[PDB]
Amino acid sequence: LAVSLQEALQEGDTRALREVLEEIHPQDLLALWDELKGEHRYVVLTLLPKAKAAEVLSHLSPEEQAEYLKTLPPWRLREILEELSLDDLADALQAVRKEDPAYFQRLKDLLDPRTRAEVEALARYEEDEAGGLMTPEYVAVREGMTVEEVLRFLRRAAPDAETIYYIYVVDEKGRLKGVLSLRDLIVADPRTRVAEIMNPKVVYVRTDTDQEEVARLMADYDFTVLPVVDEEGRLVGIVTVDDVLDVL
Amino acid sequence: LAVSLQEALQEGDTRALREVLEEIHPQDLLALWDELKGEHRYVVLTLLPKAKAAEVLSHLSPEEQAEYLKTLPPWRLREILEELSLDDLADALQAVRKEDPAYFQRLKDLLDPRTRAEVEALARYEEDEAGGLMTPEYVAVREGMTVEEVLRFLRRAAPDAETIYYIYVVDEKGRLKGVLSLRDLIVADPRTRVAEIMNPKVVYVRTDTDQEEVARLMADYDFTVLPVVDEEGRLVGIVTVDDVLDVL
After folding, report:
1. Which of A38, A238, A243, B145 is most deeply packed, by most CB within 10 A?
2. A156: nearest CA in chain B?
3. What is the CATH number of domain A1-125?
């Protein structure tokens, strides 16, 4: 089935082409690839059995991965996607994002709500910006908990806390409500609600916000640390000045 | 007694000179001064009655004040000084210091131990220094007091504390023993002695240390505040980065 198909091709023959693709291994394909013609790589995946073609795409370079998500038929775009592993579904879309995100949105929709939703929750950590700096090790508390319940929970995790110098407030849902400076906790009565103390006014930034921002932002303000939220307003990280003194 | 003396002078006459100086008011003198000759201002104070001559020097510009403490006889140096008001005694010596401190020490000795000691507990005039920046409003605690006794004393004075961000430790005598970061107090058991928590290793600086130092020091270290001690190792102030961002 090697050069056994290169015939079904040089001929415009719609038969001996479908025959070898049926009994053609993904791998057997992932090989001669780099030698083939633009045109060739475009009919294979199109005629290939919807579970295989996928097996293939999910293993090519990226620049390619999104470019083929742009010429491949709408119907062939649906099928390929549904057969990817969620993870290889993760790196996929992200590879398309980096370039054209405008298409990022019309592609999430062509998806299945069950799938599109799922994907929306993995979908976002690129090698550059907020995500590629933050360290999930910060400290958070609920805004109801008394200064008492808190201080008690602080000795416990003072030892796994990057710094208890800037404590974040969050609600049931996991979204940021403000910041609490250590300077406050000590003076406030142990009976007051974290609400009555925290400044709801804290400066965050999107996981996808550019690393040129958080440096500017963080420098203008003379901050040492700085909270990162996602798209629903939820705390998921902390960017520091040193990881930003590195991004130069 | 005006030009009524300018005769006792142009003559080398040791008599009609002592006669008008006896009934000559300090003021009457502090005037025509700026017109007189170096030489003249030198015999007046020398023959003048030891309580008056003083009354005079303690009111002249500074550059002068120390220069005359350098040509005036050893015996005339003793008498003048003892009649100064301690305060006018304060700015006096300080004016001599700025230039020649080497003489600062042989002058404190020509003093009376009772007086020399008293005077030693005085100054603060520095080159914009240490002293000309610090704000006696910082926060201190004894190293014995339990985290309990402390926290309790913190809500009380949180309201008169420039920052309870860097708490200084001090002993009976009033000398600095180390620094305590807020970060610590919260975690530590309320029963521990401040000793078992504070870093005795805190970077201070002399009240007389150059404002070019505390900027360098404070910049290399990334400190926001910085404790000032005197010569016995006692806390008396806090220099901040903003008062040092000012000294340019």
Report:
1. A238
2. B187
3. 1.25.60.10
Residue among A155, A164, A187 whose CB faces B155 most closely = A187
**Contacting residues of B for A164, CB less than 8 Å apart:** 183, 186-187
Beta strand A140-142 with A166-170: parallel, antiparallel or unpaired?
Answer: parallel
Residue B243 in marked binding region: yes
Candidate from A165, A188, A189 with C-beta closest to B183: A165
Instruction: Number of A to B CB contacts under 8 A, please give it.
Output: 36
Give the residue on A whose Cα is nearest the Cα of B184: A158
B181 known ligand binder? yes
Residue A183 is nearest to which of B155, B165, B188, comparing CB atoms? B165
Buried b or exposed e, range A74-104, using 16+ CB within 10 angstroms: eebbebbbebbeeeebbebbbbbbeeeeeeb
Contact between A247 and A188 (Cβ < 8 Å): no
- At how many Å resolution was this determined? 3.9
CB-based contact A186 B183, cutoff 8 Å: no
Q: In the CATH hierarchy, which fold is given to the domain comprising B126-248? A: CBS-domain (3.10.580)
CA–CA gap between residue B90 and residue B94 (Å, rounded): 6
Question: A187–B158: do the CB atoms touch at under 8 Å?
Answer: yes
Task: Determine how many CB atoms are found less than 10 A away from the CB of residue B219.
Answer: 12
Buried b (16+ CB within 10 A) or exposed e, A231-244: eeeebbbbbbbebb
* H or E stretch covering A107: helix A102-109
Where in chain B are the domains? 1-125, 126-248
B212, B217, B221, B224 alpha-carbon torsion, rounded to 10°: -60
Residue B185 to residue A185, Cβ atoms within 8 A: no
Measured from the Cβ of residue B8, the count of other Cβ atoms closer than 10 Å reads 19
What CA–CA distances, in Å, run from A53 to A67, A96, B150?
A: 15, 18, 70
Tell me the C-alpha distance between A65 and A97, whole Å. 11
Q: How far is B236 from chain A (nearest CA, A)?
A: 23
Measured between CA atoms, the residue of chain A closest to residue B167 is A183
Separation of alpha carbons B174 and A87, rounded Å: 64
Distance between CA B86 and CA B236 in Å, rounded? Answer: 21
Using alpha carbons only, give the angle B170, A180, A134 rounded to the nearest 5 degrees.
105
Enumerate the H helices of B74-229 as residue ranges.
74-82, 86-97, 102-109, 113-120, 147-157, 182-187, 213-221
Burial B106-143 (b: 16+ CB within 10 A, else e): ebeeebeeeeeeebeeebbbbebbbbebbeeebbebeb
Go through chain B and list every residue after which a break occurs, taking a C to next N gap over 2.5 angstroms, comma-separated.
none
